[PDB]
Amino acid sequence: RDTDWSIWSLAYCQVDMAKDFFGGAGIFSNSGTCINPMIYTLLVGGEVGGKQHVVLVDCGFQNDHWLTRYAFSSWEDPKDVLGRVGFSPEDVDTILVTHMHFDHMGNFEAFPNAKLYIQLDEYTGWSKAVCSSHQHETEEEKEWVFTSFDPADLIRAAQGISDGRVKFITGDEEILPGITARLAKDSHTFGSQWFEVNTHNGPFIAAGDIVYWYSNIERMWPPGYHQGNAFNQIDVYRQMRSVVKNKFERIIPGHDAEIWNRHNTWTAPNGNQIAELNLKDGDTSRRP
Amino acid sequence: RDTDWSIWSLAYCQVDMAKDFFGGAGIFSNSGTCINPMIYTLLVGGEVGGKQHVVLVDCGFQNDHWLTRYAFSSWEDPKDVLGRVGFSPEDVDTILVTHMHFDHMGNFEAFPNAKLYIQLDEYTGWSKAVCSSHQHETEEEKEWVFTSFDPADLIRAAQGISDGRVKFITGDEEILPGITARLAKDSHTFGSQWFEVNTHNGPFIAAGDIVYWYSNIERMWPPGYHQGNAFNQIDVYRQMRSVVKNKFERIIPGHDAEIWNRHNTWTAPNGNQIAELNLKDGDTSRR
Amino acid sequence: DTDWSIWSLAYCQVDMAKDFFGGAGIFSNSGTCINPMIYTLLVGGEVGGKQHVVLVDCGFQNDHWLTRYAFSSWEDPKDVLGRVGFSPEDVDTILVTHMHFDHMGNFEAFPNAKLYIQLDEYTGWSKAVCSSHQHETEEEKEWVFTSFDPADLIRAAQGISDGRVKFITGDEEILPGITARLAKDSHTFGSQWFEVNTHNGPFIAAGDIVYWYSNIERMWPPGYHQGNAFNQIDVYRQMRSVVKNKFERIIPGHDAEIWNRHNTWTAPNGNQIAELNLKDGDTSRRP
Amino acid sequence: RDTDWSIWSLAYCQVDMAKDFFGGAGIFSNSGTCINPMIYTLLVGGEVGGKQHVVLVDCGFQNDHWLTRYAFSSWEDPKDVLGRVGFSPEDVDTILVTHMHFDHMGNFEAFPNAKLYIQLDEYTGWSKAVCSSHQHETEEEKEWVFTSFDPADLIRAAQGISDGRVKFITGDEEILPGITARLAKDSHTFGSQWFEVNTHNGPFIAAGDIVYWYSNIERMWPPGYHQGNAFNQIDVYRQMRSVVKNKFERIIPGHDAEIWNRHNTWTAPNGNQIAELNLKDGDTSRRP
Amino acid sequence: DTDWSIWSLAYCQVDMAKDFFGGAGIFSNSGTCINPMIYTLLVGGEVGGKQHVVLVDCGFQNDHWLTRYAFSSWEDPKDVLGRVGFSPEDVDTILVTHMHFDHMGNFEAFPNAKLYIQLDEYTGWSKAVCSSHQHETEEEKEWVFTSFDPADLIRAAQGISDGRVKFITGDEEILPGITARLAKDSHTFGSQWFEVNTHNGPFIAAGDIVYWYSNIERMWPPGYHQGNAFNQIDVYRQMRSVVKNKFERIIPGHDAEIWNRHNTWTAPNGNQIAELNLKDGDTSRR
Amino acid sequence: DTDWSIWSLAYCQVDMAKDFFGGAGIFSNSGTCINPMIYTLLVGGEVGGKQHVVLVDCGFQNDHWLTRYAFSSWEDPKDVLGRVGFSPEDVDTILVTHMHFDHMGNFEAFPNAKLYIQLDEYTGWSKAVCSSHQHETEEEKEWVFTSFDPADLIRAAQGISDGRVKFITGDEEILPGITARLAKDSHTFGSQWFEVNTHNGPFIAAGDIVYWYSNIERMWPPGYHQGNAFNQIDVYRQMRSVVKNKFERIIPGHDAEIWNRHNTWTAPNGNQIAELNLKDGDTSR
Ligand SMILES: [Zn+2]
Ligand SMILES: [Zn+2]
Ligand SMILES: [Zn+2]
Ligand SMILES: [Zn+2]
Ligand SMILES: [Zn+2]
Ligand SMILES: [Zn+2]
Ligand SMILES: [Zn+2]
Ligand SMILES: [Zn+2]
Ligand SMILES: [Zn+2]
Ligand SMILES: [Zn+2]
Ligand SMILES: [Zn+2]
Ligand SMILES: [Zn+2]
Structure with missing residues (x-):
């Protein structure tokens, strides 16, 4: 089957963060801070002459308590972030979840028509991890387990499973035409997955937090914060x-402001960026 | 290492059901119906000279929509059932869940101080199965998986996990002093577990639905309805x-009125039975 | 590339409680009914090349099994296969869905045929028979042997020594256009079903994984089986x-409904004969 | 200690055989032939003061075509072999099968009251191997598979399974009081097992053909003919x-005349040997 | 029936960024500090008698590795062992927690010591070193070799050939009262920790699974490591x-706090020395 | 679309008991015979692509091993490869069937070649070497080292760090038309054989899984091996x-019968040269 997809990376928030967090405890230690985007990626396309899909890789977090747990700024609603590219949250039929951290699957219920795809190992891993954490007597002993994980997202996932809106992928699978999910077990998280997007202009990768920063994969140096196996990430980078084929601009990192320096980018009124990574044959640009 | 436990099996409801359902196709086919108890079991004890635990194996379902999906009668609140043996739901500190069928874990939130114990395979099995079933285009094609399973219990299970009230067992484990959980993978359900209870009068077994009826294990004949592997059940029977040691009255089946005939049993006003299976050193009977 | 013509032939009939085949809930206490005992003949292979004459299963012999259960109208392979223009000597390969007596019993009646069975089926039954002899009584073994003849274990071993039995381990395209599919712990330890590719699209020989169309149409596994009910659900899918949900393309094991869904002749006696596919020039063997 | 066993190794036949077969292709190539005993081992005991079991480790082959496929001589019936130590074949309640080669299980039906214990992997291994062999067009291409295996023993085993005479062991198991079966997967054969026998004078090992000759385990040099994994045999030797504890005489090899030099031994009229390896407490010697 | 004397000796020091050892987030951009390089001497065994001289880890030689990091105060083993009454050649056994340079580099300075290391540790590094060489530039190889010397792969092989090294595969009580614990994919492919059963309770040589006491106390894996963050959480438990949550009985890999909570006395260059347990019938040391 | 020229080159000869190579049963007490020591030259790859020059195995050096067995006629890679128009410097790839001394001992004579070994072979020998040193005497270690030199373990580790050795894990097409097939616990822990696809059909470099044509023709594994006899049976299949049962298409490890099945000529000292295949557009010798 021939496939083609338009791809936009959309900032919906910004985080000021220690560099070693994203870039590595070696090379980026004691290197100050910088602003990094909170991103989800819109894919529109599929089989040519077939159903057109409107897909989100990840969907951001909500305007809730998480805004106080880190140095966030410039948060924007899905109505506004997607409106600038000519869509609405209602139009989104599929959310592909790289991992169940709060900033990639929180707020999925803002897309009432979307089905959620999660790796089984991600879901089961977090169920076990959350349950195990309650053997510690204090929350200080649980802090690391919950640094990026909202137990309420466990409840929402179960609710979606029972509702028929959450679907499990087990391993590798071409879930949409030209989008292949790749299980990276115990990489960034228990069941992180990345996505291979095949377009007429060649492949693109939505890496999730397996690749926080381009420097992770270019320097082969896993980040200072992750919740998996650093050598597994080495294997995934390869x-x-x-x-x-080492065309590094084709990989979408999770939280790297460097992405705006590498693609046709324009900014919204508040500053949040929009990137036009690729346009399928016959589509028009969204620059004002 | 010296454990001792008092054991009461208490009926909270009754169901009228075709016999082959519980007893088996072929041998009990076309045998009409009979009343069968809906049961949970109270265990009080632990290490002699130690903390006396109050534990439930299973806890029944709620008086909710389930009362109409089967021929149930005489449903009773846990306050009424445990009161007859001198306890209240607030006393229960542990609920041992044989499996996640609605009638064994439905009403657990009625015991606000209890921790829930479930096999990881039971929880993960149902998560996969519920999700897989929503690939069918009609609701009729989904009936069989949900005949005994409430997706609302999956949600409550997830909520208790994050609350810290649900704990996973993975395999065999002595979770309380003298009570060892036994994983029976893919027997009655994905992660059914049974419980070995060690007292001064020897072992007792809480079998769950692996053994619906004594005849399941006496005739080595699995039931006409189950959601696992029939030959695995045979192995568990062994x-x-x-x-x-083949003293069958020492096994507590899930849904067999025959238990009231094998132990010291009396009746409540509505008819629900209370079988006293064992009394630990120093305890007086509660007839 | 490949094409095959297909006939399903009865060789006996069985009166059985409906819950046996259809499910303990929905078909309980529904009386009994007549069900055909069937094996399926396939003739063909690759288009320009060796024509194979194949049987899926081969029925049982007229021995003590006629007094087991309640059979009627039993017929010899010489009679059943002659009506379609063949003799028992023509069959060069018999595909065994599982080693229950009525699907592999009479295999020595086809002297030129190689028998194909899953390694897990043979190993499972070897273990199960041996394990059952841990029970002291014959009544405790009844369920293991409800459908299994220990003499067929010996005949299977005799055939292994003869070179007449070949093991399949998992999926395999055995004959041209016929793929065996292992369904581990489905009806039995190593049940297998067969995908048959013709010019008119695919056909499935389901064995007893699907006793009745209602098993797979309603997604409701049978009341009697010796495997894993949820595994059967996965196979149904x-x-x-x-x-492609064209259900008449699935050959159930023991369902009279197949005569209502396909060109079906009838024999001098009751046992039926049903055409399913005729690949170009196979003159219909319909009178 | 609560268990005790008397132990006799009894030769029932002799075989003239090339030395490299039993001792190894390195040291014993082109080294001629020698006479080697065909042996099964009688164990009498159990719980001290409780049931006196009568046990055979292996039971030899029958007087059939096998007598001509090798240089056999002096085959003797179980009535005569066991008679010399004061027992009869009807006394044997248990036959422990090291492996299903013809000379270790061929004759089990001459012991009408005995249950056979065989490793599941041994039985399934031979079932597969026999069935696979019939893909070869000539009987010569099957010859190695059948050098020590009789397909008729497949049928007898299936018959014993159906009768309730055959019991499967899967892995390690204390089968009788003081006797533990040890699976040695893929050693001499698919499911070879050896037996540790606890006596008041310490442990004895019935090695089956894992150890043909003392030299195999003393020199750590597996034989030139076997149907398993040579390095696995190395590991079992250890x-x-x-x-x-390196008391090599406590190990009963399968086919080594050296065993008559290491234990109290006398001979029958025909030359077949009797070795009294151990006498449990209270037991009297059987030397004439 | 089993008793052990236990000493933790600092053979060197490193000035290192805090998030490296303590964790990204809670120690991000928090500056740096001096941290010790230690190996752990245990001598004793079955109270019956046979006394073994065992080292957990054995430092790195004084070579190019001294310039690769902010090292100082590197001392010889004969120097450091002498201050507690021993000579390298006395060591019977070297228990290797993992094959990073600074726990396995100088094992040849102990000609009598058998080396015990996990099969997965050795096998994992063989795999990794080989995999890295499909990277064309040296910058891409940097992280794989931050703590690993390819020359230690060649020594290990030479040790295998010589009979100096033996592979553990799983848990195994390697010497009377010392249980080796396989922690697959913790700090490294096959890191292991050791459980020393002394008459005065239990002791744990953690290796680099626990860089700092605060890794285990704060349940917070470090910012640099080469295995599985959640696996470390489960080994912490x-x-x-x-x-029994008595943290002092755990010896971390590179925490100067260990000197703070155990009898310590500086040496000439300052490299500390702490005695954690002297088996009754054993003589102390300053 | 692949094509390869194939030559089997004897670089040495060994006088050995027949049962060693042929079997403890059939060839017992059968005396000895001369057997070739062989490595195979492959030149080709994808048609229209980078033509590779590959060695399957590379022999051992003229060192102590020349005295550990009845060897004769040892020749250098410079001489043996010189006769077919190449030198050791041309070989960029050596495919190693197993780590026995006579198949990897001399790989450093090929300074530009990458070495490909099964991971299970390397870890297998690493483990077995360590286990062997638990025995207190050297006679108890003899069988483990009959064909294995611990110096090759050290040379292997050095190549690992140098980047000259690569691990294969299971089956893999390493070069166009050459598939490595792991045969776990066959002749050794991680023996591998190679399927070579040419325009005249497939050829197999069997290593020592097949010492002699009679192993696979008689379905009878050898009297000396360090793996699993029934695994070899299955590999033979x-x-x-x-x-398709064209046995002349299989390259055995040590069988003089090979010179009788192909275009063969001899060198001055006696060592044989076998031209098994010439890819489209090639001239004989
Ligand atoms: Zn994340
Ligand atoms: Zn993120
Ligand atoms: Zn149930
Ligand atoms: Zn129930
Ligand atoms: Zn059946
Ligand atoms: Zn049937
Ligand atoms: Zn044998
Ligand atoms: Zn033998
Ligand atoms: Zn370190
Ligand atoms: Zn380290
Ligand atoms: Zn070799
Ligand atoms: Zn060789």
Whole structure:
């Protein structure tokens, strides 16, 4: 089947963060701070002459308590972030979840028509991890387990499973035409997955937090904060490099402001960026 | 290492059901119906000279929509059922869940001080199965998986996990002094577990639905309705027989009125039975 | 590439409680009914090349099994296969869905045929028979042997020594256009079903994984089986996907409804004969 | 200690055989032939003061075509072999099968009251191997598979399974009081097992054909003919040496005339040997 | 029936950023500090008698590794062992927690010592070193080799050939009262920790699974490591359980706090020395 | 679309008991015979692509091993490869069937070649070497080291760090038309054989899983091996299936019968040269 997809990376928030957090405890230690985007990626396309899908890789978090747990700024609603590219949250039929951290699957219920795809190992891993954490007597002992995980997202996932809106992927699978989910077990998280997007202009990768920063995969240096196996990430980087033949601009990192320096980018009134990574044959640009 | 436990099996409801359902196709086919008890079991004890635990194996379902999906009668609140043996739901500190069928974990939020114990395979099995079933285009194609399973219990399970009130068992484990949980993978359900209870009068077994009826384990004949592997149940029957040295009255089946005929039993006003299976050193009977 | 013509032939009939085949809930206490005992003949293979004459299963012999259960109208392979223009000597390969007596019993009646069975089926029954002899009484073994003849374990071993039995381990395209599919712990330890590719699309020989169309149409496994009910659910879905929900393309094991869904002749006696596919020039063997 | 066993190794036949077969292709190539005993081992005992079991480790082959496929001589019936130590074949309640080669299980039906214990992997291994062999067009291509295996023993085993005479062991198991079966997967054969026998004078090992000759385990040099994994045999030798704390005479090899030099031995009229390896407490010697 | 004398000796020091050892987030952009390089001497065994001289880890040689990091105060083993009454050649056994340069580099300075290391540790590094060489530039290889010397792969092989090294595969009580604990994919592919059963309770040589006491106390894996963050969390719980949450009975890899909570006395260059347990019938040391 | 020229080059000869190579049963007490020591030259790859020059195995050096067995006629890689128009410097790839001394001992004579080994072979020998040193005497270690030199373990680790050795894990097409097939616990822990696809059909470099044509023709594994005899049986079946029972298409490890099945000529000292295949557009010798 021939597939083609338009791809936009949309900032919906910003975080000021220690560099070693994203870039590595070695190379980026004691290197000050910087602003990094909170991003989700819109994909529109599919089989040519077939159903057109409106897909989000990840969907941001909500305007809730998480805004106080880190140095966030410039948060924007899905109505506004997607409106600037000519869509609405109602139009989104699928959310592909790289991992169940709060900033990639929180707020999925703002897309009432979307089905959620999660790796089974991600869901089961977090169920066990959350349950195990309650053997510690204080919350200080639980802090690391919950640094990026909202137990309420466990409840929402179960609610979606029973509702029929959450679907499990187990391993690798072409879930939409030209989008292949790749399980990276115990990489960034228990069941992090990345996505291979095949377009007429070649492959693109939505890496999730497996690749926080381009420097992670270019320097082969896993981040200072992650909740998996650093050597597994090494293995995944090599898989990703092979898919895109080291055309590093084709990989979408999770939280790297460097992405705006590498693609046709314009900014919204508040500053949040929009990137036009690719346009399928016959589509028009969204720059004002 | 010296454990001792008092054991009461208490009926909270009754169901009229075709016999082959519980007893088996072929041998009990076209045998009409009979009343069968809906049961949970109270265990009080632990290490002699130690903390006396108050534990439930299973806790029944709520008087909700489930009362109409089967021929139930005489449903009773846990306050009424445990009161007859001298306890209240607030006393229950542990609920041992044999499996996640609605009638064994439905009403657990009625015991606000209790921790829930479930096999990881039971929880993960149902998460996968519920999700897989929503790939069917019609609701009729989904009936069989949900005949005994309430997706609302999946949600309550997830809520208790994050609350810290639900704990996973993975395999065999002595979770309380003298009570060891036994994983029976893919027997009655994905992660059914049974419980071995060690007292001064020897072992007792809480079997759950692996053994619906004594005849399941006496005739080695699995039921006409189950959601796991029939030959796995046979193997579990053999383990149970070995633990109990073939003294069958020492096994507590899930839904067999025959239990009231094998132990010291009396009736409540509405009819629900209270079987006293064992009394630990120093306890007086509650007839 | 490949094409095959297909006939399903009865060789006996069985009167059985409906809950046996259809489910303990929905078909309980529904009386009894007549069900065909069937094996399926396939003739063909690759288009320009060796024509194979194949049986899926081969029925049982007229021995003590006629007094077991309640059979009637039993017929010899010489009679059943002659009506379609063949003799028992023509069959070069018999595909065994599982080692229950009525699907592999009479295999020595086809002297030129190689028998194909899943390694897990043979190993499972070897273990199960041996394990059952841990029970001291014959009554405790009844369920293991409800459908299994220990003499067929010996005949199977005799055939292994003869080179007449071949093991399949998992999925395999055995003959041209016929893929065996292992369904581990489905009806039995190593049940397998067969995907048959013709010019008119695919056909499925389901064995007893699907006793009745109602099993797979309602997604409701039978009341009697010796495997895992949820595994059967998974297989039902695999089969539906292969056949694009064109259910008449699935050959159930023991369902009179197949005579209502296909060109079906009838024999001098009651046992039926049903055409399912005729690949170009296979003159219909319909009178 | 609460268990005790008397132990006799009894030769029932003799075989003239090339030395490299039993001792190894390195040291014993082109080294001629020698006479080697065909042996099964009688164990009498159990719980001290409780049931006196009568046990055979292996039971030899029958007087059939096998007598011509090798240089056999002096085959003797179980009535005569066991008669010399004061027992009859009807006394044997248990036959422990090291492996299903013809000379270790061929004759089990001459012991009408005995249950056979066989490793599940041994039975399934031979079932597969026999069935696979019939893909070869000539009987010569099957010859190695059948050098020590009789397909008729497959049928007899299936018959014993159906009768309730055959019991499967899967892995390690204390089968009788003081006798533990040890699975040695893929050693001499698919499911070879050896037996540790606890006596008041310490442990004895019935090695089956894992140890043909003392030299295999003393020199750590597996034989030239076997149907398993040579390095697996190396690993089992180490387990055996450790159990007997390097008392090599406590190990009963399958086919070594050297055993008559290491134990109190006398001979029958035809030359077949009797070795009294151990006499449990209270037991009297059987030497004439 | 089993007793052990236990000494933790600092053979060197490093000035390192805090998030490296303590964790990103709670120690991000928090500056740096001096941290010790230690190996742990245990001598004793079955109270019956046979006394073994065992080292947990054995430092790194004084070579190019001294310039790769803010090292100082590197001392010889004969120097450091002498201050507690021993000579390298006395060591019977070197228990290797993992194959990073600074726990395995100088094992040849102990000609009598058998080396015990996990099969997965050795096998994982063989795999990794080989995998890295499909990277064309040296910058891409940097992280794999931050703590690993390819020359230690060649020594290990030479040790295998010589009979100096033996592979553990799983848990195994390697010497009377010392249980080796496989922690697959913790700090490294096959890191392991050791559970020393002394008459005065239990002791844990943590290796680099626990860089700092605060990794286990704050349940917070470090910012640099080369295995599985959640696996470390689960080993933290296995350790906490073995010592009943008495954290001092765990010896971290590179925490100067260990000097603070155990009898310590500086040496000439300052490299500390702490005695954690002297087996009754054993003589102390300054 | 692949094509390869194939030469089997004897670089040495060994006088050995027949049962060693042929079997403890059939060839017992059968005396000895001369057997070739062989490595195979492969030149080709994808048609229209980078033509590779590859060695399957590379022999051992003229060192202590020349005295550990009845060897004769040892020749250098410079001489043996010189006769077919190449030098050791041309070989960029050596595919190693197993780590026995006579198949990897001399790989450093090929300074530009990458070495490919099964991971299970390397870890297998690493473990076995360590386990062997638990025995207190050297006679108890002899069988483990009959064909294995611990110096090759050290040379292997050095190449690992140097970047010259690569691990294969299971089956893999390493070069165009060459598939490595792991045969776990066959001749050794991680023995591998190679399927070579040419325009004239498939050829197999069997290593020592097949010492002699009679192993696979008689389905009778050898009297000396360090793996699992029934695994070799199953591997024999895979090989026979690939070549559709054309046994001359299988390259055995040590069988002089090979010179009788192909265009063969001899060197001055006696060592044989076998031209098994010439890819489209090639001239003989
Ligand atoms: Zn994240
Ligand atoms: Zn993120
Ligand atoms: Zn139930
Ligand atoms: Zn129930
Ligand atoms: Zn059936
Ligand atoms: Zn049937
Ligand atoms: Zn044998
Ligand atoms: Zn033998
Ligand atoms: Zn370190
Ligand atoms: Zn380290
Ligand atoms: Zn070799
Ligand atoms: Zn060789």
